[PDB]
Amino acid sequence: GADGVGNSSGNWHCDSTWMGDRVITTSTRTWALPTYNNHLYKQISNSTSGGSSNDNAYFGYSTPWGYFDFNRFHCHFSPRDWQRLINNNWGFRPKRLSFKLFNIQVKEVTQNEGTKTIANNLTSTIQVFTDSEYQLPYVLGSAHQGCLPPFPADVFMIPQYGYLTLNNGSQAVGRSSFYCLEYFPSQMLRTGNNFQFTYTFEDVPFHSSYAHSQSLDRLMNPLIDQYLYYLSRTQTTGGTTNTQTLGFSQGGPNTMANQAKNWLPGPCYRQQRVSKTSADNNNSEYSWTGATKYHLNGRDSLVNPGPAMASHKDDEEKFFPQSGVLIFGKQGSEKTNVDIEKVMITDEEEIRTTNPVATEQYGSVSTNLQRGNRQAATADVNTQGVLPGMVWQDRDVYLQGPIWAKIPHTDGHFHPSPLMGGFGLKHPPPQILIKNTPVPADPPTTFNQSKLNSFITQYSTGQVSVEIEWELQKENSKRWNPEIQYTSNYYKSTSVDFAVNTEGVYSEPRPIGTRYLTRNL
Amino acid sequence: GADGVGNSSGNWHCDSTWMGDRVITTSTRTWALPTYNNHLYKQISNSTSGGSSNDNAYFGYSTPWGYFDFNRFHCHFSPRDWQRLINNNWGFRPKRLSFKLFNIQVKEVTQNEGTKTIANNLTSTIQVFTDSEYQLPYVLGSAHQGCLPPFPADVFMIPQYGYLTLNNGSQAVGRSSFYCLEYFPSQMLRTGNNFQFTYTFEDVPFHSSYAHSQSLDRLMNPLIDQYLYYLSRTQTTGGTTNTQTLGFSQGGPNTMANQAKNWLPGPCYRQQRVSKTSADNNNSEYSWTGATKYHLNGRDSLVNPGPAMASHKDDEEKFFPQSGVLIFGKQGSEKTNVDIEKVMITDEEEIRTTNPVATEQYGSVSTNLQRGNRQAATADVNTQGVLPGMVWQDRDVYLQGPIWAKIPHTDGHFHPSPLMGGFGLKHPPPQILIKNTPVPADPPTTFNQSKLNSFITQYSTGQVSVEIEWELQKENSKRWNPEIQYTSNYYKSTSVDFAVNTEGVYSEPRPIGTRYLTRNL
Amino acid sequence: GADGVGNSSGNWHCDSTWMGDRVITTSTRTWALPTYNNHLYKQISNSTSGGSSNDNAYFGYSTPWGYFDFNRFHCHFSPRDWQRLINNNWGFRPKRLSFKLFNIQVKEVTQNEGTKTIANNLTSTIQVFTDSEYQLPYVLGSAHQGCLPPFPADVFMIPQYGYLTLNNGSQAVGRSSFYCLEYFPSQMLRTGNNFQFTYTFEDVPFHSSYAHSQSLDRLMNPLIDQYLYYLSRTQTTGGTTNTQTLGFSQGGPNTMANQAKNWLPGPCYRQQRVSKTSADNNNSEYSWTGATKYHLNGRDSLVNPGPAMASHKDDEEKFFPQSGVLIFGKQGSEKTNVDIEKVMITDEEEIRTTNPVATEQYGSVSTNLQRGNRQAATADVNTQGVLPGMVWQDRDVYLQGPIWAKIPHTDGHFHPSPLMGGFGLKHPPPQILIKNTPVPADPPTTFNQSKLNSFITQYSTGQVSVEIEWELQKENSKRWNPEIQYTSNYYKSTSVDFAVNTEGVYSEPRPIGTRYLTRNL
Ligand SMILES: [Mg+2]
Ligand SMILES: [Mg+2]
Ligand SMILES: [Mg+2]
Ligand SMILES: [Mg+2]
Ligand SMILES: [Mg+2]
Ligand SMILES: [Mg+2]
Ligand SMILES: [Mg+2]
Ligand SMILES: [Mg+2]
Ligand SMILES: [Mg+2]
């Protein structure tokens, strides 16, 4: 679209539409875009931000571009719509996206004698493009701040785009890449113009928005014995002189733990157990030393949140895996060393039906060959890669959590469900990059070859709309008794949950997952 | 409609058109809309406004939206047109509505060094929508200020939209609802754009713009006796020793009070009688203690104005029911404890032909079983719900009074004529909500996740037009003698009634009802 | 249908099918039918059952017929299906019914020498008809035992049909009617035969399966004053000598109780308040003396549950109206003077938004004419019939409660929603009457005129299927925040709710209503 200065280039579209097997979410927001980096590209590294350890070293570039991020479920679903989703469906997945930018306003700022003057610069442009061929480092999928706000009335600033390449400490290597975003075709928009983009999601598995009502070790008929036998006795019982024997039994109703089974619990990468009650924990600094890590090219990274494992076993709700769960901040919570009361620790207990508990061993294996003089020895398995016959559930998604991630362009990518939860896509929603076009201030009247460094101070503002179509897998529960449902609490409160307070601040008081409904295994 | 900055988006349309059985009213006004709540939604309650009693406790939200209110007859009818209506018609009802917003101007306000600068912000928008599916609390119908002014030359400010939900004192409950109006599709308008809406009224009964020339107790032929008998004597007359007897008589011309009749006067909910002359009243505070009330979930509300009852009986014009009549303010009258000379108390004496007097008993009922040792006992009926055979008239409408109300979405709704007077509609003219779109001021040049709280100061102004088509029921009076008509008074005055004074202030000097013409019962 | 002895005449059909705006429920059960009254019709009265008081006197007849009763929601909806209904819909109503009887077995019982022999009587019949023209007293709608069991595996006995006519004490009157059910055409079925019937429900209002999120006294805009005035002062404030005055104010945000309003709360018939905690109640017998009653032809009946009124006001959950709520029994609870822990008292608190609290006055009315020597007097209104402008909600329905009732064939029937809750139908599902055809034992070989009184002992058994199609009004909540939903409790339990225990007994642990979702008023 193209029109004049006094004509609106779009309307406000916020609402959800529920049809048969589909839901279409639409959210509109107002954004503001500053000029970033005074129009420059800059080399950055851990030595440019300060510098401390090799584990945290990097090299990259900060760019003068901003970008759009709507990779959080709350950018699309109101809490009520989320409730409608999770209480009634066994699965969902994204199908298509439509994105629009409109009602663009470019503003000039003049700073003289302490006076603050903001005027419309009717002839200035913004630049917008989509990285539809995935030629730039993809930073969506790294759970960054800068998303479309959950509350439609909230105005937000667009985040600055930067990227990383290869480093050796704070230095670049020959394989290090530099990208110039002006080396891309971009649309130029004045105040009368608008931008639109459409995208189709690839076929991805439905997210499992249910919990299992059976455990993997309890799939048998509890009334009938097995025809198969297990070794039940290795030593004679009774008398004074106990000797070697071999006794075999059939597993049955009272020996379910010994029964022959067809399947195995999902893979494990053991995490340390932390109590939500500080007094139950060790008096030492183990946030790093006791952490579960991966080692890549001489540096350690936290495995966070890592493989989908259950948070805790039965009646152990006060424990969580050190870095094995998503942890969200309560409204207004600060960046550093905030108390437990300022965060919301997610609970993945529902997957304990098929997935090992994050803080316990996967199991026990034999480590020797027993004989007359050597007793049978076993060891705990704290890391268990995939085995044939293993089954598992992936991590849940949350209203305030991420939606998708880009699957790394690699030769191998086993079960590429992103570990933070969500949908793994080889070709995800592309990065939408935006910047204010530099407008030079008055040049000298004698030629000078130097690049111009005096610009008129500008920012831009407008509206953004994002529409996502989602496919649903409706609940078909043949269970007799009522199910668990997400419900607001009936009792009297100073404020209503998922609303604004007396000062106009919107808050999300808790994480809301998707696994309320149940099904058999 | 969509056009440029130098082109008008509409014309001024104010006038009435009288046809055969229809009148089309059109009024145009100029409005101004500020930014409300600094773009925020806020939780409000009786503790946020102060707090005193449980009877006045509430919980709700203030929104940054304004709304249009033209739910008063004087927004559509000039006093002369009202006179034409009431002097010539026995009834009327609304049929259709057309609403337009045009000649939108968005203005930026700059406050530096005490200097007041107002400039046009040619690229800013307003947002407008109609709640056509009645998904929001409906506040029209609660006789609020903020209507289109009666005088076409008067410029008005649009009122702020807020709503209530359930409360327990100043606190919310689980059933309490929060609504975000940005969760609705709304049209975005710049200075070249306009908005239009059309609506059709459902079939509603005509308002009875007449008074009855017969009373319910005087429908008989005054020359002829009845064939039916009543009990006229229970004791012998004459002598020294009076004994029990049963004597029966036929009602006739001199015993109309005893005649058999087919109908009953309308229902009653008794109000206290107050004299317009202070000296005739009791020396106590009874505005609340002597008030007629309803009790709902532990709190009392005034029954105001309540069931349509006649204001007073014959030659008792100085008395009014405590809260049983509409009371309007004279021009410029203040909010609190104003004298009687500052208000205009309506008079519903015309309905005393079928409806009980508001301040008297409905009648008398027997309370015992009389016999030799027990005398017949009766009691006053101060509350009388509907009985088969009851007939009544609804409350009159006034030039300065309300037009419609939304019938509550309930299972039962007996004779849903709104008690303040007017037309009860299940699907009334929808709420038209409007706001100024927030325009952020210059954002920081380093990304910050916090919602933006610095905006450019703006307001909007434009024109609004409302057109209503009304259906008329023409007077067909077969009466020989002249009727009562509303007339201006012939005598010399300092000012003419329903005009402006020497300072340019328009005033409405009296309430004007609709019941001048008469008809039989 | 008609077939042989070795061929099944029908299949087991139990399941629900959810479509767009419809749900079809199907339940199949096994029944047993004895011979009732040894094939006789008998006159019954309070003198035939014992006799105590005139309030309990009756006259009627016991018949040898049984009948089918499926007038309870749990005969059709599993608890899970009920949850699906109430969490997702704003209303529902019945549309059509299909009824089938099949796999009929007639059994002969022989009692000789203490030996119990049961054999098939392949040539015996049962008789079945529908009272499709409503020519018999309709006893469905009187909340009787004998319904299709909620649990599909439970086998039930069909109840005996009897009816009442007019009485004067234990005696009949001339207007008393006697009905012979053999004076009707009935189908005769042997073991190879089946019976089918179809019915269509008349247009009835949807049941309101929601609660209001607004109260009737809080429909105003909380930010704006009214243009209307009320009488706020009757006496001067300040000084030593307080005198009569008239002061008027406009209702506003802090005077919501005084604001002019259009509507009135629903009708009232006051009930006594009883605490669920025995120690808070009076130490007297008031179950009858303190009861709310109606008086009909010299006898008193309890008003039970009576007009739909709210059970209690805010923070008063321990109180219930004496006979103003439905009270269900827990599984196995006995007929007489059972403890509070054996019953389940329903709570109608959700309707307090429009309906008066059952145990409080409707309001207050004026009872006199105040003047200099007479102070303003008011009285409580404990009975309030319908007034124009009243709005209300009807009583909720429950999973274990009744579905419909027959509207009495009368000249007048105001808002004929059955007071126990449910759907009022002029032409309800007809009575389905069934009996075992008498099979005489060996007659004498010499003629005797006396009716035969020696029969072979028989009973019958078979299956019954009932299919109801229901229309739904889907929830379209534009509320931002999550709603209340019915949910099973997440915590560990010895048994799961709405399941069987270790002995195979099914129980319904609580009443489940339909008002979880909310909407504005
Ligand atoms: Mg977000
Ligand atoms: Mg847990
Ligand atoms: Mg690659
Ligand atoms: Mg007005
Ligand atoms: Mg008068
Ligand atoms: Mg409603
Ligand atoms: Mg039952
Ligand atoms: Mg309650
Ligand atoms: Mg009848």
mmCIF file of C-alpha atoms and ligand atoms in Angstrom, chain C residues 311-312 317 347-349 352, ligand 8:
data_model
loop_
_atom_site.group_PDB
_atom_site.id
_atom_site.type_symbol
_atom_site.label_atom_id
_atom_site.label_comp_id
_atom_site.label_asym_id
_atom_site.label_seq_id
_atom_site.Cartn_x
_atom_site.Cartn_y
_atom_site.Cartn_z
ATOM 1 C CA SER C 311 -28.929 -18.633 48.974
ATOM 2 C CA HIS C 312 -26.893 -16.071 50.942
ATOM 3 C CA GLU C 317 -21.657 -19.441 52.917
ATOM 4 C CA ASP C 347 -25.859 -23.052 46.634
ATOM 5 C CA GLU C 348 -27.606 -20.464 44.393
ATOM 6 C CA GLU C 349 -25.299 -17.512 45.427
ATOM 7 C CA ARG C 352 -27.486 -12.515 43.833
HETATM 8 MG MG MG D 8 -22.465 -19.777 48.511
#
